[PDB]
């Protein structure tokens with residue numbers, strides 16, 4: 001019945017917390033070498049004997065742990081993605097959800113009532129892990145972005161608000177004819193340059209320190225805005241599109257990607273939940289639809305635009321000057 | 322990919338809070354009389370304009386509201402079961418989750434580390450009550466006592482369903498007012514009585530059948546076995562004890578509701594726990610009951626029955 005599906009979603013915070021706590025505990029990392037019996041896993045996590053078995057078996061019943069003859073083991077997904085120290089480790093996402101996001105969303109009612117953010121504005125190694133996970137998700141968007149656009153038509157690309165440069169680096173690795181410029185605040189420069197040095201791209205990639213609310217954007221054939229316009233109130237986003245249009249040549253493109261809401265605002269749960277995340281986290285940020293963005297790009301003067309799926313929950317709007 | 326499913330479970334607290342806040346705001350009760358445009362719904366709920374449309378549309382995307390021409394309406398399920406004031410209302414589970422359980426489960430880590438609790442319905446009991454009345458041949462018995470009866474919903478339904486029965490509700494004295502109200506509502510008169518007491522301090526009422534609905538799981542195992550001993554002492558030869566719980570499956574690898582309930586018991590009680598049918602049958606045999614059986618009762622709730 002539909003009411004059963006609804007109650008299951010409404011009480012989803014419990015199953016959520018089980019996985020979140022397991023990640024915060026590093027439970028899956030303790031099983032990376034091989035299976036462990038219940039008492040050994042409990043002792044390594046320093047859990048009380050009262051509920052350790054229940055906790056482990058809940059993970060088994062949720063499909064994220066295996067158990068055979070009293071010994072628990074990783075599933076293929078947790079061995080691959082929830083083992084700390086591996087290059088593919090995404091557990092930092094869950095670690096940050098457990099440490100911060102879970103309680104932040106506990107203030108949804110007050111954010112909805114006041115319209116005001118409910119995080120630190122209202123009031124160590126987990127940040128590295130979370131940043132590793134962000135770089136991971138960024139890489140997925142970057143792999144798709146490299147294949148979704150005919151990059152042979154362009155010679156230069158500028159990533160606006162590039163952070164550590166993951167998308168830009170992967171783009172230039174997949175398309176060796178491209179030259180790239182990452183644009184971000186000066187404080188981002190060392191993280192970006194460490195990835196630049198690791199990539200071996202050399203002079204093909206540069207960083208420009210800047211504030212995009214106070215100076216022009218680098219000229220390039222393609223400008224990329226990944227998770228940029230959504231952080232700000234709309235007049236500030238339109239300012240950025242004007243600067244993008246001024247930075248581009250004729251036939252150059254702007255690429256905007258976000259966890260966009262579907263145009264009819266009735267299908268895309270992750271995009272709509274992200275709009276609520278922007279409520280809780282920023283003064284004026286917001287998630288939007290592709291159709292919203294196409295209207296802004298038309299106001300800014302772009303000749304044409306289209307919405308296109310990217311990967312995971314991400315999609316993009318591409319416009320031509 | 323199974324990893325995409327894992328990540329959807331892990332972040333399920335977001336969609337959960339959307340629904341919980343909706344239920345605590347009575348949003349579906351506001352749409353009970355008819356559809357409303359977003360602004361009118363925003364005004365009636367006292368929500369800020371920044372995010373009201375996002376919130377309403379998330380509920381549409383989750384499939385619990387419908388929207389057309391800018392007007393929102395209940396779905397059939399939310400009109401049938403999430404509208405306050407109706408006897409079928411199931412939203413009390415959601416309201417208490419939003420007020421208490423969401424943040425309580427935020428302390429799951431401390432519970433697991435310390436083993437200590439971290440905390441310091443009539444409709445949902447009615448589904449079990451109806452199933453209990455139909456799953457047991459109550460014509461074989463004359464009297465029934467419900468041990469820890471709360472407001473008496475299950476016992477009242479049994480007596481309404483089987484008019485030959487005489488019933489006794491047993492609970493702490495503080496529960497008696499709420500029992501008396503439901504007893505007065507039922508018109509059952511002399512066929513139903515409340516007995517105040519503490520089942521760890523005094524014997525249980527004698528009856529042909531004793532019912533333990535969501536009792537044993539609240540207590541450490543020695544105390545649960547003590548209750549089964551007292552049930553054996555209170556029953557006649559051929560009498561039955563009826564236990565119902567959201568039992569974990571015997572292999573302890575599939576029943577997510579039962580396993581989550583055991584963690585709920587961790588967070589809420591000093592020594593309670595969820596258990597399996599096989600567990601309960603062993604306890605019943607140790608207590609001297611002749612025979613026992615486990616059957617599904619109603620959705621996630623199962624029943625263990627034993628005969629003296």
Ligand SMILES: Nc1ncnc2c1ncn2[C@@H]1O[C@H](CSCC[C@H](N)C(=O)O)[C@@H](O)[C@H]1O
Pocket residue numbers: 138160161162163164183184185188210211212213225226227228
């Ligand atoms: N005023 C400003 N000028 C330049 N960059 C800014 C800025 N304000 C914020 N940023 C940058 O914008 C980025 C937003 S996070 C987005 C990072 C990346 N595009 C991705 O998709 O993962 C941050 O790296 C932040 O440093």
Ligand SMILES: Nc1ncnc2c1ncn2[C@@H]1O[C@H](CSCC[C@H](N)C(=O)O)[C@@H](O)[C@H]1O
Pocket residue numbers: 446468469470471472491492493496518519520521533534535536
């Ligand atoms: N020591 C005690 N003596 C008698 N009743 C007790 C008790 N300790 C707890 N209880 C009762 O046990 C009940 C547990 S809640 C379960 C209520 C009911 N059987 C149902 O399924 O809905 C509460 O009503 C509480 O009042």
Ligand SMILES: [Cl-]
Pocket residue numbers: 156219220221
């Ligand atoms: Cl150029």
